[PDB]
């Protein structure tokens, strides 16, 4: 056939470029970074009404100060999360401190290109890694299967990404509050989602310095959805 680690004539790794196509088919995940915190939101996208939606876990805790959202072949993310959690806890053991968000992200991204003929293929999932440390404050990173990670003020990944990113382009500014960011994720998720957005098919989360990483209750998110509807009807 052909090598797994083969370069195309354009100078790109076939398998990495193909894994990016799998991520495009994944459910939408959005992250927005502010000076009051970073918000992470996801589309759950249950394949049937009999599927208990609260068992869909696409937002995940890595440490108290680092959260993570995923999009694509979500099964692939489990070993990445396991490595991230181990890296975070191990660094605390060696250095009696929290690990920097960038350093955690870099550790995860080191796995990405460890494939060949090590694992047999790249990961088929993209990660939004959000967190806080004392050195660089609130941070949001986008970890790809290429091994590259970009820091973002706001980022959308998944099927509605380019449409959502264009919307994030206009809406984001440096003085956003946490509440404003929460509604903004809900607004953009509702726009790109096939089904109608509610507290059962969408999930919110955030990371603050005080309280750390928190996944939002369905009751808490429901109020923010109702708050969103009213403010859009307000003009």
């Amino acid at each position: 056939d052909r090598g797994v680690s083969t370069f195309s004539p354009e100078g790109r790794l076939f398998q990495v470029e193909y894994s990016l196509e799998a991520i495009k088919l994944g459910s939408t995940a959005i992250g927005i970074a502010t000076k009051e915190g970073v918000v992470l939101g996801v589309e759950k996208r249950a394949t049937s009404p009999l599927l208990e939606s609260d068992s869909i876990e696409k937002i995940v805790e890595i440490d108290r100060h680092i959260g993570c959202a995923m999009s694509g072949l979500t099964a692939d993310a489990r070993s990445m999360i396991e490595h991230a959690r181990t890296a975070a806890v191990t660094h605390n053991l060696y250095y009696d401190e929290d690990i920097n968000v960038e350093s955690l992200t870099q550790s995860v991204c080191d796995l990405a290109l460890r494939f060949g003929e090590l694992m047999s293929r790249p990961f088929g999932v993209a990660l939004l890694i959000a967190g806080h440390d004392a050195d660089d404050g609130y941070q949001l990173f986008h970890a790809e299967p290429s091994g590259t990670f970009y820091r973002y003020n706001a980022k959308a990944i998944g099927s509605g990404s380019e449409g959502a990113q264009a919307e994030l382009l206009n809406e984001w500014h440096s003085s956003l509050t946490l509440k404003e960011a929460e509604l903004l994720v809900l607004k953009i998720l509702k726009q790109v989602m096939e089904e109608k957005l509610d507290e059962n098919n969408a999930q919110l989360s955030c990371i603050t310095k005080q309280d750390g990483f928190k996944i939002y209750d369905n009751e808490k998110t429901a109020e923010l959805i109702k708050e969103l509807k009213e403010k859009e009807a307000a003009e």
């Binding site: 193909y18 196509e21 799998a22 049937s48 009999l50 599927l51 208990e52 072949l73």
Partner: protein, 240 residues
């Protein structure tokens, strides 16, 4: 050692070996899971192309992983034994180190992790198996029902079916299963499970297997006559 990358991405972003593993599940006999208020019922199809079979010794479709958790499947039979064995070993290992039996979610997460591992390891193909894992957590009376598939994704279900003609029985369950009021008793839950299989099975004779799991390690498999009584009562109500 044999290191060949069998599971790989295609230009359209698909892993065909994982997708072809799902086609093996589609070929497998139908399996169904329905959870009531205080029980879970696992229904399984037995294709009647094979008679002269010895039903005493023939591998049963539902397997106990521990005294409180069970696993049924659709797809390659030989493949399922490997997942069942690994699960049973992990269940004992968990009891040995944590001094507490596995939760149904934990056991599911383990099996799903094994399945995932086989989709990006060299020299191996994915499992041609989807599983339904059901039971009750230790000292808990809330019913649990989970599904896994070759890719390694897993999730919780109020009711679910897998295997051949699973589209049809899922159609049935989606209109007949009410979340606000699930099958309150064992009878109601078994009845709904048998009804759902009768949409697909053919004859209601030895083609339907039923296993009822209740809290506190109370697992029992229904016999032919017990199931036949459900089959009789369902069709007599249908003649109207």
């Amino acid at each position: 050692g044999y290191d060949r990358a069998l599971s790989i991405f295609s230009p359209d972003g698909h892993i065909f070996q994982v997708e072809y593993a799902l086609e093996a599940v589609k070929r497998g006999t139908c399996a169904v899971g329905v959870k009531g208020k205080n029980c879970v019922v696992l229904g399984c199809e037995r294709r009647s192309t094979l008679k002269l079979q010895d039903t005493r010794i023939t591998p049963s479709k539902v397997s106990k992983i521990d005294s409180h958790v069970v696993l049924s499947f659709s797809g390659l039979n030989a493949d399922s034994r490997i997942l069942i064995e690994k699960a049973r070993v992990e269940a004992q290992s968990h009891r040995l180190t944590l001094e507490d039996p596995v939760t149904v979610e934990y056991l599911t997460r383990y099996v799903a992790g094994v399945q995932q591992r086989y989709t990006q390891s060299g020299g191996v193909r994915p499992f041609g198996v989807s599983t339904l894992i059901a039971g009750f957590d230790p000292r808990d009376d809330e019913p649990k029902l989970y599904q896994t598939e070759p890719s390694g994704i897993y999730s919780s279900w109020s009711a679910q079916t897998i295997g051949r003609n699973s589209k049809t029985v899922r159609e049935f369950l989606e209109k007949n299963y009410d979340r606000k009021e699930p099958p309150a008793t064992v009878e109601e839950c078994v009845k709904l499970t048998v009804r759902s299989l009768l949409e697909v099975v053919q004859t209601g004779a030895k083609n339907i297997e039923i296993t009822v799991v209740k809290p506190d390690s109370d697992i029992v498999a229904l016999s032919s006559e017990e199931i036949n009584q459900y089959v009789t009562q369902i069709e007599q109500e249908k003649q109207e």
